[PDB]
Design a binder for these strands. Structure first.
Ligand SMILES: Nc1nc2c(ncn2[C@H]2C[C@H](O)[C@@H](COP(=O)(O)OP(=O)(O)OP(=O)(O)O)O2)c(=O)[nH]1
Ligand SMILES: [Mg+2]
Ligand SMILES: [Mg+2]
Length: 378
DNA sequence: GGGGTCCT
DNA sequence: AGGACCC
């Protein structure tokens, strides 16, 4: 019996922005990347605006829409780490998922609390927030009692986040990662809900597309949808034999457990990042002098990031995207080069070679993306 | 779109 | 090196 919590910040980028220029707190807001509105405050979803939505569809639906550019993730990333560091303080094992989601395993903490309690105040243990599906609490159910303590820690987290960081968000408490994440969004925004075990089927059957299961993306969905498997219950019910023989004993076995609300995966300690990368897409790049400048630019920011980081990377990757999947070359970063200096020149030289490897400087080319990644950190 | 993770 | 997943 684990007690896991999923923390999900409301319209993160927008939130971070609204904290910056408070003048936009009352005004519906979109955060913009090229031609997309990636996220908007609630004041604006109110008006049909949806996450990842065209600026033409955006502006029209709401010509009162305000916009900030969010291509530079710097400030979001920093707040992201302030959030998880904050959660790491409740309990050290925190798993990040993107910039705006965290899992924390609350089991050891829940136990610690209960022991400190006596029969009286156990009376007495109440929920913080919503109980999924208005299910009834049985105070004599040890599992019920533990999930409620969880809800109490969740609430303390949510309050700490707001009081210390001004951030708002949802939490979902449950017995594994799948359910915690599934339940955290039942009441939005800035609310939390807890999942009692006897409501687990209800929760998973509440989904409408098998892709709404975390663990099941485009490819798998499509492959499933071609086997006639469309509902959670189809997947639950479909032939284990056939499914294995179809997506591999690996995928098949686990995504079938997922369909029953079953998820054994541990909450892993994310710790410091295992890669830094910058990218920029564009209409077209067809010269190698543009590239170098672009790449000098990506390489620029990366340098300050790792510089400010305190560890050193031992390999670089260059990623590109061609005219109308991606491609990449990597190589170790040399000994002395891992180090008040002119790291640019040698670095860009490496990237350039790697660059030419993929690109034909003599045969015209059309690139729609450049990216530099520093991995293999020590 | 601008990022990340792990597996193969 | 590429693939799939996540946000
Ligand atoms: N899922 C997804 N998120 C992206 C993408 N590009 C940027 N993001 C960032 C922008 C948003 O701030 C964030 C969306 O994550 P969430 O699903 O948790 O929603 P968000 O926190 O933005 O607001 P919400 O309360 O969920 O409406 O992810 C993308 O391509 N897919
Ligand atoms: Mg959210
Ligand atoms: Mg999914």
């Amino acid at each position: 019996s684990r007690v896991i919590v999923h923390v999900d910040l409301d319209c993160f980028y927008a939130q971070v922005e609204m904290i910056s220029n408070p003048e936009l707190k009352d005004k519906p807001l979109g955060v913009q990347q090229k031609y997309l509105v990636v996220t908007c405050n609630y004041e604006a979803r109110k008006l049909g605006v949806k996450k990842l939505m065209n600026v033409r569809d955006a502006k029209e639906k709401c010509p009162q829409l305000v916009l900030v550019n969010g291509e530079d993730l710097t400030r979001y990333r920093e707040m992201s780490y302030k959030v998880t560091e904050l959660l790491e303080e409740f309990s050290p094992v925190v798993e990040r998922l993107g910039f705006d989601e965290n899992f924390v395993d609350l089991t050891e903490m829940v136990e610690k609390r209960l022991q400190q309690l006596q029969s009286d105040e156990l009376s007495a243990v109440t929920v913080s927030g919503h109980v999924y599906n208005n299910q009834s609490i049985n105070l004599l159910d040890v599992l019920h009692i533990r999930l409620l303590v969880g809800s109490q820690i969740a609430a303390e987290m949510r309050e700490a986040m707001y009081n210390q960081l001004g951030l708002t968000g949802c939490a979902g408490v449950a017995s594994n990662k799948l359910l915690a994440k599934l339940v955290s969004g039942v009441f939005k925004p800035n609310q939390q809900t807890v999942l009692l075990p006897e409501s687990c089927q209800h929760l998973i059957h509440s989904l409408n597309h098998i892709k709404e299961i975390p663990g099941i993306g485009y490819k798998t969905a499509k492959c499933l949808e071609a086997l006639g498997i469309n509902s959670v219950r189809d997947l639950q019910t479909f032939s284990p034999k056939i499914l294995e023989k179809e997506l591999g004993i690996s995928v098949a076995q686990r995504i079938q457990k997922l369909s029953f609300g079953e998820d054994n995966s541990p909450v892993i300690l994310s710790g410091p990042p295992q890669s830094f990368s910058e990218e920029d897409s564009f209409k077209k790049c067809s010269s190698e002098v543009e590239a170098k400048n672009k790449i000098e630019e990506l390489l620029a920011s990366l340098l300050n990031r790792v510089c400010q980081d305190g560890r050193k990377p031992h390999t670089v990757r260059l990623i590109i995207r061609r005219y109308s999947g991606r491609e990449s070359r990597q190589c170790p970063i040399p000994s002395h080069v891992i180090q008040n200096y002119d790291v640019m020149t040698p670095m860009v030289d490496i990237l350039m070679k790697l660059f030419r490897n993929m690109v034909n400087v003599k045969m015209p080319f059309h690139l729609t993306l450049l990216s530099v990644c520093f991995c293999n950190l020590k």
